[PDB]
Design a protein around this ligand. Structure first.
Ligand SMILES: Cc1cc2nc3c(=O)[nH]c(=O)nc-3n(C[C@H](O)[C@H](O)[C@H](O)COP(=O)(O)O)c2cc1C
Ligand SMILES: Cc1cc2nc3c(=O)[nH]c(=O)nc-3n(C[C@H](O)[C@H](O)[C@H](O)COP(=O)(O)O)c2cc1C
Ligand SMILES: Nc1ncnc2c1ncn2[C@@H]1O[C@H](COP(=O)(O)O)[C@@H](O)[C@H]1O
Ligand SMILES: Nc1ncnc2c1ncn2[C@@H]1O[C@H](COP(=O)(O)O)[C@@H](O)[C@H]1O
Ligand SMILES: N[C@@H](CCC(=O)N[C@@H](CS)C(=O)NCC(=O)O)C(=O)O
Ligand SMILES: [Zn+2]
Ligand SMILES: [Zn+2]
Lengths: 338, 357
């Protein structure tokens, strides 16, 4: 109220709330514990007293208009009650819900909540990482092990609840803020046989699913690395995706022939024109492709001449559109030639 | 037993224990809940059934020999009781502890637990992120906002763990923190697996024998890719030579070093109007490669020296004085003589630089 209602403002709701408050989000918060209300007021937090399962209190908190309801109620039965009421009466109100445990998670999934958050799960993973670190594992390797286990465990719990092809690897860190690439992708979508995988949408925590990515690469004939140039090179997540996905025994080495015969296009946008690259011992835009070409060739790919969209610092929306067209044109040309 | 004791095998201790089983960690469990017996039997887990706070149970569990005790007990008083008993009787036993909330976190910090993990804290942040995404924020930008929130939140709770339990004091800290949220050599070391390194590890050992060297191991400091820009910029402010040291990966640099560049070389600090913080400083690329020079005969622009271009261009743009790279080649097929000698040469490069400045 205006945009978010938070039901329950104990330890869980408080942290969700304060994160949202930091971002300027306007909210209305309900909690049924009078002592919790007191302490929150001591810290200058505005919180309303009542049972969030009461329809009258939800309506006066603005449920008919709100965009998101955070269900931070601890008790499974009440938490589920709230979720079922909201689903029934407020069909546009997106519910993001805490789950006490796996049984509660399954129930919430079945009520139609997309990604219920088991309240101790991420804390218990962190504690596991700390135990690994104390036993002498490097923190990064320990984080990676926790990532593998999380992916495995979510798959398991999800199963319990149930019970001329072009692949564009897009790596813009801020897709919603893009002008040049966003337009390029709009134009590329109008083609047939184009899949787009936006790495920063898929893997905001830098935990690549190698098996998923290798499957998508299997189905592709042209692979495209599309991104804004950053510091004469590529974004961090794309470098991570290469390091992980182009794996020993798959992309290279004995038996690693998965990419043989496929083609790779570098599609990059820059803030300067060709003039900006006349610096250092090996000047010129084309020299910057070397590490990417070498990667591609090592793994048995065919490197295509890059598509380079120059001058974005000093460019208009007209020319941003002309270059988006040249991009679609490049891709179409590839497809017809194939 | 052999190395780890987990006290409590509820929702929390079960996840932590299951993660360690995937790492082949030897563990024994202290639990007193009849409903967990079958779960523990199914994993083949040795269990000492009873109150974990009992000295006789702890000794039977091997506490005098264990490296780590994971205190996953839910009840804050019982969890503190076990913490205190262990600190008193088993001086070498490292305690990793669950915390119920901020008051409990503070009490564990005061009992000498280094990094108590507030049980719902990371799950609530994830929830906060899913909300932000549902309001239209991109998942990556939403994660970054959670990282900034976390950094400040931990700072605030650490400040509170030094004041007294008194609410008005704690309240002041929160208000102050909430407002806030609304020839020296510096080696930036970026091996993803420092403990597994042979060549870089030896290079660092040698560099450590010089005077005025500081090493920041990025993958130790930031395993979650959440760089603290202010801490990095402070350390750069003190350095005269900056070294980027790492194993080469796919003809280029590791992801976390690229993130460090993208984040730390900020507009108005490293470049742009007023961005002169790096002017006068020097940069050395110090890189190890598996292949020899012959390995870089690939692509339209062959040869190792070409691969420095994006890095040299980055330096020049930020007003750094680029030095000739240090490159140790042939790690795949080099001996331990060649690998100790190359590391000595690294030390010689740094020393020679110190002599000229
Ligand atoms: C961290 C950072 C580093 C950048 N480095 C370069 C650079 O090396 N060369 C260049 O021409 N532009 C550089 N830029 C500009 C981007 O390439 C440009 O803003 C982008 O291509 C615009 O595309 P978009 O509208 O899709 O965001 C950089 C931008 C940022 C954020
Ligand atoms: C993901 C990955 C990519 C690599 N790419 C290259 C390569 O581009 N060229 C090369 O000569 N060595 C490459 N290597 C080999 C490493 O550079 C080499 O093993 C490392 O420098 C050894 O140093 P260390 O003993 O400190 O680990 C790569 C290694 C990994 C894991
Ligand atoms: N029906 C309800 N309406 C509003 N708040 C609730 C309800 N049931 C539980 N709560 C609150 O949910 C919060 C849960 O605490 P915690 O487990 O610390 O997040 C407490 O502050 C409770 O008062
Ligand atoms: N004194 C104790 N000794 C051993 N285990 C305990 C003790 N007190 C609580 N626990 C366990 O801690 C776990 C906490 O449950 P949960 O919140 O689900 O992680 C349960 O398995 C309890 O049996
Ligand atoms: N005594 C409580 C909760 C007390 C509480 O809500 N504490 C706040 C600080 S006033 C908290 O820990 N919020 C979560 C956090 O800040 O990490 C309980 O154990 O259920
Ligand atoms: Zn975005
Ligand atoms: Zn390591």
């Amino acid at each position: 109220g205006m945009r978010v209602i938070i039901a329950g403002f104990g330890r869980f709701g408080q942290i969700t709330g304060r994160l949202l408050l930091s971002s300027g989000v306007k909210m209305v918060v309900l909690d049924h514990d009078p002592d919790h209300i007191e302490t929150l007021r001591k810290f200058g937090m505005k919180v309303f007293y009542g049972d969030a399962t009461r329809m009258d209190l939800l309506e006066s908190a603005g449920a008919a208009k709100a965009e998101v309801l955070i269900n931070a109620i601890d008790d499974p039965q009440t938490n589920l009650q709230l979720t079922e009421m909201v689903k029934e009466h407020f069909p546009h109100l997106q519910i993001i819900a805490r789950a006490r445990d796996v049984d509660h998670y399954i129930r919430l999934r079945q009520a139609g909540v997309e990604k219920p958050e088991r309240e101790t799960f991420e804390g218990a993973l962190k504690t596991g990482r700390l135990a690994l670190e104390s036993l002498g594992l490097g923190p990064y390797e320990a984080r990676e092990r926790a990532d593998v286990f999380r992916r495995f465990n979510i798959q398991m719990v999800e199963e319990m609840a149930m019970v001329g092809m072009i692949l564009i690897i897009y790596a813009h860190p801020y897709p919603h803020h893009s002008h040049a690439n966003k337009r390029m992708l709009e134009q590329a979508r109008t083609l047939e046989g184009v899949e787009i995988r936006s790495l920063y949408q898929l893997y905001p925590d830098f935990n690549i699913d190698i098996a998923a990515e290798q499957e998508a690469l299997s189905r592709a004939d042209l692979i495209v690395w599309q991104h804004p140039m950053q510091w004469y090179s590529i974004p961090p997540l794309l470098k991570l995706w290469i390091d992980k996905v182009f794996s020993h025994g798959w992309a290279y080495g004995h038996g690693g022939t998965a990419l043989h015969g496929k083609h790779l296009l570098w599609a990059v946008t820059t803030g300067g024109g060709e003039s900006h690259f006349e610096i250092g011992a090996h000047p010129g835009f084309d020299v910057l492709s070397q590490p990417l070409q070498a990667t591609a060739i090592y793994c048995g790919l065919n490197w295509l001449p890059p598509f380079a969209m120059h001058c974005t610092f000093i460019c208009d929306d007209e020319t941003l559109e002309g270059q988006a067209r040249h991009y679609k044109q490049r891709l179409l040309e590839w497809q017809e030639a194939h």
